[PDB]
Amino acid sequence: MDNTGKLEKQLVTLNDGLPKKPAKEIIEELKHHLYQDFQKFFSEEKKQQYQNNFALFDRDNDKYINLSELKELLTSVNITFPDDELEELYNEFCLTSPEADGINEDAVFIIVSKKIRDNDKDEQLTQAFKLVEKAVNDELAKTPNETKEQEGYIRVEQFKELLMTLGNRWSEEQANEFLKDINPKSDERINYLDVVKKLMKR
């Protein structure tokens, strides 16, 4: 009795059974998970087109194309990477397949996966700005005594719970940083347009 103590540390230990399967099978299943998103991200036309821009640079028919051949495939498909990003992507697959003289057909497909997957993330994030501005303007028109300057300006209470709807959940904890990062200037209002710029720039 007497409530003698105490603050005790119930240390949350990350011992939740790291994948007991061998690293090889871990790799195959991770690859399958990556390819599954590929399947929907790219129409069958895109899939059966990337070979029509992979092989001729894969002149040797070994199913492996160097970084230059990968970039040529990208240019032919009208999808372009920055030099550094494309080189990194090609070299990562070359390392993961040391017995491969570059990036294989699957490697090129995955590189396009990353490209148009970043593009789709940006497009969803952008379409988010459209609904955000729609709601901001509608609520501002619901308050006719508030100047149009607020178009773009939005409250802290007008900027949080939109993190429960679309894409891949930014929870409430994933609703925190941007505030500190962009410094609401003692007003707790930060332009959703400024958030458009920053989130499109990341």
């Binding site: 603050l7 119930q10 871990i26 904890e173 609703a175 925190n176």
Partner: protein, 294 residues
């Protein structure tokens, strides 16, 4: 097709069965003088997924571990799952299966391993997933020991989240509320520290109000961090212009894939069954009082 009929299950009934197993566990815990179990988002989602996988496939330790990795699970976890077949010549009905789930909870209370995992005093987060097919059913429970558990996540103001959580650890007070991209692990998407957190140490509860719009809200999780000696945390304290939060001194405690707790549907359905419970109880007590008067 002509002979075998469909057996689809309602989401409302799924939530009913899951929370009823949870409440039976809580009732047994209080009967034995044990702490009631809160709904951990990670455990709940992972257990639902695992039971859904179980009804059509057998237990897979590697598959469960990979699912936990994808969800970004945190902390030690204990799993209790059971699959049972229907009678060869017995009719299957909604109330039949619901009383069968009651009996599944009773058999959990009658089973050593699963009851022990459910009632472990150290473990303080529990998630339930109930699933089944035309031939069998499965119940899955995922429990863990953690400091902070989510008691309320609301959507009152369209643009002001509020994940209300209670810290089950005294040394640890919620300090860091931040996460990184599940798809982009290195991508520290969004998070804050005490200056934007309302922590009441006595309950060790925490709320907060801050900003982030309809950006990426389908899959990823919720990374609740805590600090030692909740007193030292400058909760909702104005950080100097040259002062920014440091998560390197902040301990990750709970990674629960984001979901409204209770999600408006969960909350409304739960209030529905509760209110009907009090309605039935009042009718029964009226009848009992009349009988006692006679």
């Amino acid at each position: 097709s002509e002979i075998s009929g469909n057996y689809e299950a309602d989401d409302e009934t799924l939530r009913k069965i899951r929370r009823d197993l949870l409440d039976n566990i809580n009732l047994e815990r209080r009967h034995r003088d044990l702490q009631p179990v809160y709904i951990d988002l990670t455990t709940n989602n992972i257990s639902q997924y695992y039971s859904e996988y179980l009804v059509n496939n057998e237990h897979n330790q590697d598959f469960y571990e990979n699912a936990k990795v994808r969800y970004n699970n945190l902390g030690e976890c204990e799993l209790c799952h059971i699959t049972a077949k229907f009678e060869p010549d017995a009719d299957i009905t909604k109330e039949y299966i619901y009383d069968y789930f009651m009996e599944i909870g009773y058999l959990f209370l009658e089973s050593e391993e699963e009851k022990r995992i459910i009632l472990n005093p150290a473990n303080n987060h529990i998630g339930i997933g109930v699933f089944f097919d035309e031939i069998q059913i499965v119940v899955v429970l995922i429990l863990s020991e953690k400091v902070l558990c989510i008691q309320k996540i609301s959507q009152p103001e369209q643009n002001k989240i509020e994940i209300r959580g209670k810290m089950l650890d005294e040394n640890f007070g919620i300090y860091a509320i931040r996460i990184m991209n599940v798809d982009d692990q290195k991508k520290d998407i969004k998070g804050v520290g005490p200056e934007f957190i309302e922590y009441t140490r006595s309950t060790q509860e925490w709320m907060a109000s801050f900003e982030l719009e309809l950006y990426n809200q389908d899959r990823m999780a919720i990374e609740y961090y805590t600090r030692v000696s909740p007193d030292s945390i400058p909760y909702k304290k104005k950080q100097s212009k040259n002062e920014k939060l440091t998560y390197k001194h902040l301990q990750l405690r709970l990674r629960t894939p984001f979901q409204i707790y209770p999600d408006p549907k969960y909350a409304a359905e739960d209030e529905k069954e509760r209110i009907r419970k009090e309605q039935e109880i009042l009718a029964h007590e009226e009848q009992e009082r009349k009988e006692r008067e006679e």
